[PDB]
A paper describes a structure:
The Gn subcomponent of the Gn-Gc assembly that envelopes the human and animal pathogen, [name] (RVFV), is a primary target of the neutralizing antibody response. Like all known phleboviruses, RVFV is enveloped and contains a single-stranded, negative- or ambi-sense RNA genome that is divided into three segments: S, M, and L. The M segment encodes the [name] precursor, which is processed into two membrane-anchored glycoproteins, Gn and Gc. Heterodimers of RVFV Gn and Gc form pentameric and hexameric assemblies on the virion surface in an icosahedral T = 12 organization (Freiberg et al., 2008, Halldorsson et al., 2018, Sherman et al., 2009). Structural studies localize the N-terminal domains of RVFV Gn to the membrane-distal region and have proposed that it functions as a molecular shield that protects against premature fusogenic rearrangements of the cognate Gc (Halldorsson et al., 2018).
Using recombinant RVFV Gn as an immunogen, we isolated a class of Gn-specific rabbit monoclonal nAbs, which protect against RVFV challenge in a murine infection model. The two complexes of RVFV Gn-Fab RV-Gn1 in the asymmetric unit exhibit near-identical RVFV Gn binding modes, with both binding to the apex of domain B in the Gn (0.5 Å RMSD). Interestingly, only residues constituting domain B were resolved in our crystallographic dataset (residue numbers 370–379 and 397–437). Electron density corresponding to both domain A and the β-ribbon domain of RVFV Gn was not visible and could not be sterically accommodated in the RVFV Gn-Fab RV-Gn1 crystal, indicating that these regions were likely cleaved during crystallogenesis. Although CDR loops from both the heavy and light chains of RV-Gn1 contribute to the approximately 800 Å2 interface, the heavy chain dominates and forms 12 of 15 hydrogen bonds in the protein-protein interaction. Loops 405–431 and 423–431 of domain B in RVFV Gn play a central role in the interaction and maintain a conformation observed in unliganded structures of RVFV Gn, consistent with the high level of structural similarity between nAb-bound and nAb-free RVFV Gn structures (1.1 Å RMSD). Furthermore, we note that RV-Gn1 residues that form the paratope are highly conserved with RV-Gn2 and RV-Gn3, suggesting that all of our identified Abs use a highly similar mode of antigen recognition. To map the location of the RV-Gn1 epitope in the context of the mature RVFV virion, we superimposed the Gn component of our crystallized Fab-Gn complex onto a reported model of assembled RVFV Gn-Gc (Halldorsson et al., 2018). This model of the entire RVFV virion reveals that Fab RV-Gn1 targets the membrane-distal region of the [name] assembly in a binding mode that extends the Fab perpendicularly from the virion surface.
Numbering used by the authors:
A (entry chain B): 2 to 30, 30A, 30B, 31 to 95, 95A, 95B, 95C, 95D, ...
B (entry chain A): 1 to 82, 82A, 83 to 100, 100A, 101 to 128, 133 to 210
C (entry chain C): 371 to 378, 396 to 439
The structure:
């Protein structure tokens, strides 16, 4: 009735080994009818393993499955940037007595590659925005790892509202992220202040881009 | 040789019944057990139902009474009797996961259940304040349902493109940005934004 | 019971029963298919009723 996987995130350094655990409250049908899947953003899941330990065709030997009954593990050896993904177990049970098939909740793998400081760009709103009533300023942080935090400042006052962030999935060659942070204000709000600042912090160190409204 | 393709995903209001179709290619009529699976945005995979080669059907305990799975010689269908906003998801079809043959999945079909009416996006250029290399972009704001497609220069510009995942606003509409890194010899770049749901296309040309 | 022929004794519990579960694609004669799923394409095994 309950399938529990390792809590997210699992952080794995490049070249390391990671384990993902799947535990079932009941034994799977015939003890080994358990399969594992990898899902990257924007894609359907891809089967890695079936029968608990048999590698599916096309899949790297770096992936291994073990276990039986109620306890199963997926091991990823020599972890690469391309292994950044969410991994799921899938159990089989008697369909008359339980769910015929049941997925675990998923376990995200974050791959720790070489650290890199972000560069930051800021984009003032296009002139045609202001007449619509709503203004949207976009700040971008390029090609960075590990995670950053973004703070927005207008005339030195830190913004607490109207901020939305969107992060690309880890690059499969170098493990880096890209982030887009958007500050949405009304036109009168936007036309009340002069300086717009986006500050991207990575650990202790901070990178800033600013523009002055109606200035270039 | 085998493949699957889901269709029928669209924006509907709550309670509007909806049928989704999985078209099967290169696989014999009664040689696999076909499931439907869904995934809500940002959430895990949820198994919904299965139809065996024999015609036998099972449903997830939560799905029983709300979903009907059926099949023909070339398709597998899923009827969603009374959708709610909680049923918003990508719906996938898949072959039986314990067989040693390739486990096939389609690309999925996107179902959106909402009271809010479909809306075309507004597209605005992103340029730095007025260099050997420069980053330019397009802000695609205020659309429903997903998806939109964004290409640059009719698909000819692909180097150094980054399109951020969409974010859902408090309003219930979606927004995203795409940026591209180009050199000074680049003529102004054009983002081609398309929204299939409203049959809308916007080309916005962007220059330093 | 059944006699099973394997493409590369065979463990018939690997063949899903009707509405059941298993790890091998099996097909067979009319008696086998009355109790088991019969999936001929890419079948691992063929099972027929044992006389005697």
């Amino acid at each position: 009735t309950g399938m529990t996987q390792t809590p997210s995130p699992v952080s794995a350094a490049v070249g390391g080994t990671v384990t993902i655990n799947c535990q079932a409250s009941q034994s799977v049908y015939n003890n080994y009818l358990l399969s594992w899947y990898q899902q990257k953003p924007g894609q359907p899941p891809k089967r890695l393993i079936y029968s608990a330990s048999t590698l599916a065709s096309g899949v790297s030997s770096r992936f291994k499955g073990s276990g039986s009954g109620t306890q199963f593990t997926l091991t990823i050896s020599d972890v690469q940037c391309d292994d950044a993904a969410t991994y799921y177990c899938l159990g089989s049970y008697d369909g008359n007595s339980a769910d015929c098939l049941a997925f675990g909740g998923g376990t995200e793998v974050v791959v720790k590659g070489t650290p890199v400081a972000p560069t930051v760009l800021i984009f003032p709103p296009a002139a045609d925005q202001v007449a619509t009533g709503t203004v949207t300023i976009v700040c971008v942080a390029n090609k960075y790892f590990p995670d950053v935090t973004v703070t927005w400042e207008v005339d030195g006052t830190t913004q607490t509202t109207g901020i939305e962030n969107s992060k690309t999935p880890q690059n499969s060659a170098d493990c880096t992220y890209n982030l887009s942070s958007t500050l949405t204000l009304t036109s009168t709000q936007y036309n009340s202040h002069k300086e717009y600042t986006c500050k991207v912090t990575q650990g202790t160190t901070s990178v800033v881009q600013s523009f002055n409204r109606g200035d270039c | 040789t085998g493949s699957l393709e889901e269709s029928g995903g669209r924006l509907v209001t709550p309670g509007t019944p909806l049928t989704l179709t999985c078209t099967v290619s290169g696989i014999d009529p009664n040689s696999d057990h076909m499931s439907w699976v869904r995934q809500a945005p940002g959430k895990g995979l949820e198994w919904i139902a299965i139809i065996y080669a024999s015609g036998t059907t099972y449903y997830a305990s939560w799905a029983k009474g709300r979903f009907t799975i059926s099949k023909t010689s070339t398709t597998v269908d899923l009827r969603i009797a009374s959708p709610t906003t909680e049923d918003t998801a990508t719906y996938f079809c898949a072959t039986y996961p314990n067989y040693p043959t390739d486990n096939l999945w389609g690309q999925g079909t996107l179902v959106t259940v909402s009271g809010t009416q479909p809306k075309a996006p507004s597209v605005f250029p992103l340029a730095p304040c007025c260099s050997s290399t420069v980053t330019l972009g397009c802000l695609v704001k205020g659309y429903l349902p997903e998806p939109v497609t964004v290409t640059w220069n009719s698909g000819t510009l692909t180097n150094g493109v980054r399109t951020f995942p969409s974010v859902r606003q408090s309003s219930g509409l979606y927004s995203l940005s795409s940026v591209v890194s180009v050199t000074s010899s680049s003529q102004p770049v054009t983002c081609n934004v398309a929204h299939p749901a409203t049959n809308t296309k916007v080309d916005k040309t962007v220059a330093p | 019971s059944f006699v099973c022929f394997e493409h590369k004794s065979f463990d018939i519990s690997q063949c899903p029963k009707i509405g059941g579960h298993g790890s091998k694609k099996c097909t067979g004669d009319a008696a086998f298919c009355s109790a088991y799923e019969c999936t001929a394409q890419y079948a691992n095994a063929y099972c027929s009723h044992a006389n005697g």
